[PDB]
Symmetry: D2
Subunit: 264 residues, 4 copies
């Protein structure tokens, strides 16, 4: 139906996009970047994340597809050589959609109410604004720990192969509706203690970070990173919303992991 | 109904057991260690694991309860001081059961067929029988990696706070039906590569370990450790069977984790 | 001889300082904070680091002593209760000095020459100024790796129990004239590789960090953190300079470590 | 002078050995495997370790050289293609020797005195004989920790790229006269605490492991692994003895590390 194509913007990706637009012109496919039904990302995983956040208000009406023009992007399940086969199978349709869970981040501020919510496909992280980073971690209203260190990272399942992995987190198959919290350089001695281990939470569990001294934090959501001031609370939970991928052939997650980290 | 009580066997635990037997005698409670309906473990987590494996053929007909006479056992949710309240609330009943997932281990041998299956509440591990440990890891029939190192550990959710934790694994809430694979001292250089990260698998995923040279392995299931010879394959999957706990009050998993590792 | 006392500035530390000044008044001790010969720090390890950097141009003419008014500071080897014994043994003298190695950091800039050097007692770290952090690591003019991640930390021996420890670094006895490099959340996949392991360098080895794209970095030296622009190179080596401590009794490093992390 | 050549024993290494023997026959070189002065190892690092232990009573009278017939052995600094250049430069001599530190392991037994000492080029490790592994760690007669876990590894500097590396240890340049202790899967909770971090000790420091319950341990020294019974103490210290290598060209340790783990 309606489709759109976002491009990394280098010469290689722009030309692939133009050629795919020409190929779609031979079918009942209409280019519309306002309310598309298929969103094709041509570039890398960064390009795909921007595509996701470009259309995160219409997630349930869109199936995403990624083409990697550089090396294998984790959200890319297509090489540029297969772009014509992509046009054709997409044109005919009859594909099946797969859904990965997402992370909801709520940021509460002081001096009254006011709230901001964000959706993450990889992760959301919290760091301080220059000084020391100290937050109380509250799990389902239960005070769990006082964290002192560089920061905290909350990952989706498909995010576990990204920042989460570099922090020592586990890789979880994206059929598991969960989120995973990992530490960044916690201090542990006689007076300061954190769990250390990554923590994996199911749906409906709420993880709340609460300031202890400084109330300014650098908060990231995927690629976006903003300094938030007068923060009262940061709440993490598995979103009710999901991202849908258009799948045309079997490419299992664990094979995707193998290709990306073991050999290809 | 029918109940039984297993004891660590020290003076403290035997006397608590005898006193609980006397208290149960004042109700319609019948001691039967053949087909009990409630199994009470008095001791530590080792005592509770033995209780579980003592009755693993009647898991769906039994609710387990643990009393820790030493420090807080992770499967113990009762102190000895509360044993009388335990007798009474157990006597009246009306409690609710909670269920944790279990791990199925299948060991296939050569020189014909023959198979052995085991159930694990904490984990199952594989090490070599003296020489180097080398196995191919196959996930859902897909060759994932060739592991060279000291061994591998596959953990249940409630097991993730045990051996899994010491190996760098994530802690997962036991409502998640999953199993987690962690490495023991893998070698990684120009010629040998493993994923490194712990891996978390959902139900219905099968992880198969396959010998490369030596076919003898030391295989553990919770406390039991046996040398298996002429092994053709070791298969891991989340069991369809579950362990049921009798719960009388709220004691959340993450509070249990906090009490055991942060402070109490 | 000449001495001075720096204070954390809370009520507890200021009063201890005034009382020690009064006690020193009963001996041939002269207060001089311009060219002191003994520098006493009253507070925590942060207070001691400021004391060190206050007098880092006269390191070879000064013996440092730390009193911890809070919990045991790692550079503090005296409790407040022993302050009078400190005055007296310091007054009589005859103590012996011990020396720990230091880290030299040289920052070279572009648009001409120009250089800045800094001395570190704990560590020096490098992070990016917002964007991705990518540096080439060059050891004794040999290209070792291209690091992609959050940053790098170079620690002195006595620094290894601080930030270095939280990053997974080894603890090294301060009689070893060395420096230790640890990674902060490196990315490792098919295209990006770092060593992962902490690296320990002897004297006369030079570790050079060289920019790949962005040339702006946040560089810390102990507590001081500055954004450096137009950076051409960051060079690390074990300093020829050393910090001298006044020692009055045996308090071994490994006992100091035990008291700080195991139990006290 | 006198030389000998040990071979991995595969067809490739035996033939290289025979060809080198023929080449040495054209010089004043005499084959003697009783009191050689040059020991050439042809194979892998395992072959080189056997060569070292074959002649560990004449370490100060021997210079070692390694040829790797498989991939780059860490103690191999020669490819098979350069074997003739090796013969010739060795024949002429005038090379310079380099020395790496070694680890001394002393095992004391009960039921009287009796002692066994061993020399290690890579490491010495301690594990239990089946049951739980619990030892008290005593550093220079100071009780440091009670270790509960899978075992402990004490590495030389050149050993730090081997088992030590897989356990999270730091890589240290072999000019540093030190040894490094790393944990194997320590348990850490409310009642059990270890340092966690690897520990690096200078010369003259003594690390003593002392049994708590079971007195039987599996003790390894490089490739050799023996069950020791009635053990009273295991003592580690940097040896006064050193291994000498014959060096013909510059091949820096950090380049050796880069070639072995980053790329080649
Ligand atoms: N200049 C492009 C670049 O090299 N970026 C990151 C690399 O990671 C890969 N990757 C991404 C991605 C992405 C896009 N980037 C950049 C952009 O959006 O511009 C934002 C993400 O950065 C991650 N990240 C940040 N810091 C670190 C760190 N220290 N260590 C590891 N990852 C880190 C966070 O998670 C961000 O979400 N998602 C996944 C995934 N799901 N699975 C597996 N791999 C993934 C990319 O293919 C690429 O190889
Ligand atoms: N002598 C008793 C002893 O100290 N044993 C182990 C300790 O671990 C606790 N623990 C147990 C348990 C248990 C019983 N034991 C002994 C027995 O059965 O005799 C078998 C298990 O050993 C574990 N284990 C083996 N090696 C290591 C290691 N290197 N590091 C960490 N744990 C290790 C494995 O997982 C076995 O299943 N299950 C859990 C859990 N679910 N959550 C949190 N904590 C748990 C116990 O309270 C106790 O503190
Ligand atoms: N508000 C005071 C505070 O809690 N600060 C840090 C804590 O660490 C201890 N500590 C210090 C110190 C110090 C002073 N601070 C503060 C100041 O100067 O204001 C600067 C240093 O911060 C360290 N640091 C930074 N980020 C992290 C992190 N993520 N994880 C661990 N440590 C971190 C760096 O290395 C800095 O040098 N040097 C050592 C040492 N040698 N041995 C053992 N312990 C040490 C202090 O007793 C204190 O418990
Ligand atoms: N079948 C041969 C094999 O693959 N063996 C080990 C591999 O490690 C390399 N290696 C060796 C070596 C060696 C010889 N072997 C075998 C033999 O002697 O037969 C004994 C050593 O095993 C190590 N080892 C044991 N367990 C583990 C483990 N879990 N993880 C990592 N290493 C482990 C210990 O340290 C032993 O000393 N010393 C070093 C070094 N200095 N630097 C860097 N790399 C080194 C070898 O090139 C080889 O690639």
């Amino acid at each position: 139906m309606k489709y759109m194509i976002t491009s990394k913007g280098d010469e290689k990706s722009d030309l692939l996009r133009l050629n795919m637009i020409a190929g779609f012109g031979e079918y009942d496919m209409e280019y519309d970047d306002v309310e598309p039904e298929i969103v094709i990302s041509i570039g890398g995983d960064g390009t795909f994340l921007s595509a996701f956040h470009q259309y995160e208000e219409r997630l349930d009406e869109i199936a995403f597809i990624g083409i990697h023009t550089g090396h294998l992007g984790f959200y890319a399940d297509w090489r540029p050589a297969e772009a014509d086969k992509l046009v054709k199978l997409l044109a005919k349709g009859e594909y099946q959609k797969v859904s990965y869970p997402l992370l909801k981040t709520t940021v509460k501020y002081g001096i009254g109410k006011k709230e901001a919510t964000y959706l993450a496909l990889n992760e959301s992280t919290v760091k301080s604004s220059g000084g020391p980073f100290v937050v109380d971690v509250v799990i389902n209203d239960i005070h769990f720990e006082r964290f002192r260190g560089d920061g905290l990272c909350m990952s989706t399942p498909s995010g576990t192969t990204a920042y989460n992995k570099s922090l020592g987190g586990a890789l979880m198959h994206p059929s598991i509706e969960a989120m995973q919290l990992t530490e960044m350089a916690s201090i542990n001695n006689r007076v300061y203690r954190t769990i250390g281990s990554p923590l994996v939470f199911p749906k409906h569990h709420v993880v709340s970070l609460q300031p202890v001294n400084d109330k300014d934090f650098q908060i990231s959501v995927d690629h976006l990173s903003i300094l938030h001031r007068d923060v009262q609370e940061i709440r993490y939970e598995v979103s009710a919303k999901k991202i849908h991928f258009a799948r045309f052939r079997s490419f299992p997650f664990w094979r995707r992991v193998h290709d990306s980290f073991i050999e290809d």
